[PDB]
C-alpha cells in the first residue's frame, strides 16, 4: 500500500520484464487478486524468470526477487510460493523456494493452499511450463 513500496515494486517489476524479453522468456499472470496485482505480478514474474533464466543469469533475477521480497516484507505478513518446474529446471525452482522461505518462513498451510492453485493451473499448463502460485496476507 505505501506509495514508496508500489514505486519500488513497479520498478523491480519493470526490470523483471526487461530481463524476461532480453532472455526471451514469456510470463503470463493467469490470475491475481486485483487488490494485490502488482505485488503478486512481481513475485510471479521474478519467480518464473528465475526458474527459466540461464544459470549464469539467474543470480541477477534471484537478486531482483530478493529485493522485491524485502520491500514486500513491509506490506506482506507472510508469503507462500508453490512451483512446478520441468526436470531440467528443478534446482532453479528450489533456489526460489529457499529465497522466499528465508524472507518469509513458508509454513505448511499456506504452502499447500498455494500448491492447490498451482495444481489448478497445472491442469491447463503445458508439460514444459513453469507454474508459480503465490499466496500473501497483507499487513
Amino acid at each position: 500500500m505505501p506509495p514508496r513500496v508500489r514505486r519500488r515494486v513497479e520498478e523491480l517489476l519493470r526490470r523483471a520484464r526487461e530481463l524476461a524479453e532480453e532472455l526471451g522468456i514469456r510470463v503470463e499472470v493467469l490470475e491475481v487478486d486485483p487488490e494485490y496485482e502488482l505485488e503478486l505480478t512481481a513475485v510471479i514474474t521474478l519467480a518464473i524468470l528465475a526458474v527459466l533464466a540461464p544459470p549464469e543469469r539467474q543470480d541477477e533475477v534471484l537478486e531482483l526477487l530478493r529485493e522485491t521480497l524485502k520491500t514486500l516484507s513491509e506490506v506482506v505478513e507472510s508469503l507462500a510460493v508453490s512451483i512446478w518446474a520441468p526436470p531440467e529446471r528443478e534446482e532453479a525452482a528450489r533456489r526460489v523456494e529457499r529465497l522466499v522461505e528465508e524472507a518469509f518462513n513458508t509454513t505448511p498451510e499456506t504452502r499447500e493452499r498455494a500448491r492447490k492453485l498451482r495444481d489448478e493451473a497445472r491442469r491447463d499448463a503445458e508439460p514444459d511450463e513453469v507454474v508459480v502460485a503465490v499466496h500473501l496476507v497483507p499487513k
Binding site: 498451482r118 514444459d128 511450463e129 508459480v132 503465490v134
Partner: peptide, 11 residues
C-alpha cells in the same frame, strides 16, 4: 483471496 498464479515458458 491474496492468491495469484502465473506460468512461464522458456525460449
Amino acid at each position: 483471496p491474496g492468491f495469484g498464479v502465473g506460468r512461464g515458458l522458456a525460449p
